[PDB]
Structure formats: C-alpha cells, structure tokens
C-alpha cells in the first residue's frame, strides 16, 4: 500500500479531501489551526498514489505527503 502522512502545517482547508478520488482522506477536529480541523488519511489501503491531494495542498511546503509503497490490485487501479 501507499503511505499518506499529514504534517502539522495543515491549515484544514479540506482541498486534499475534496481532491481524493478514492475517499482515502477525511477532515477531523483539531485545535492546532484556526480552521479547527486537520486532514486525516484513515483509508490508505484504497490510495492509488495519484497525488491529486498534494496538487490541491496550498501550504509551502506540502502538509500532505504521499510515499508510493508496495503495489496491490487496489493501488495499481486494476479492474481485472
């Protein structure tokens, strides 16, 4: 599976979660930023590693990071 990590500079903009075509990510309550919420990656077993989440992340550098890992039927996006 791929590894998806959320770093503390997340501003809780929700753009990564909206961008994810596999529903890997969700917004969770968090006091660390003014938005009152942080990206979370609970379903990385479904992550294809498309990095649409990183493309969407406005922080410099990225608050969400995708480390491509061991390939599976799911991660390779295979319908056979």
């Amino acid at each position: 599976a791929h590894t998806v990590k959320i770093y503390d500079n997340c501003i809780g903009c929700t753009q990564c979660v909206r961008a994810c075509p596999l529903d890997v990510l969700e917004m969770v309550p968090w006091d660390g930023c003014k938005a009152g919420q942080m990206a979370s990656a609970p379903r990385t077993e479904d992550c294809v590693g498309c990095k649409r989440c990183e493309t969407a992340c406005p922080t410099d550098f990225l608050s969400i990071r995708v480390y491509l890992g061991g390939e599976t039927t799911r991660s390779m996006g295979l319908a056979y």
Partner: protein, 61 residues
Amino acid sequence: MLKKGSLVKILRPESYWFNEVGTVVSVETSKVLYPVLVRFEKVNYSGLNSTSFALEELQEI
C-alpha cells in the same frame, strides 16, 4: 513582535521563500501552531504567494 506589515526573513529551509523577505499579513491570537501569515511578491511552483509560519521560523528584518 510581529504585526500586519512587518518585514520578516524566512528561516524554514523547505520553504520556496527560504532567506527571502515577506510581509506579515496577520498574526493569529488563538494558540495555533503556525500563527504568522506571511505574503511574498515571488510565487512558488504552485503559483501561491503566502503561507503560515511559527515565530521561530521568522527573523524581523
């Protein structure tokens, strides 16, 4: 002591603007991890010109 308009030098190495001078837009009063929003003239590789920093990552220039 940063406020809206203060000039700050960036100390965050992975920042597009490391060593550059930005302008403080706002300093968040509430206890947040990265409260200082800093704006730059140069856009980064995503075409954005602002991001939030901790006080330790800024030098008032």
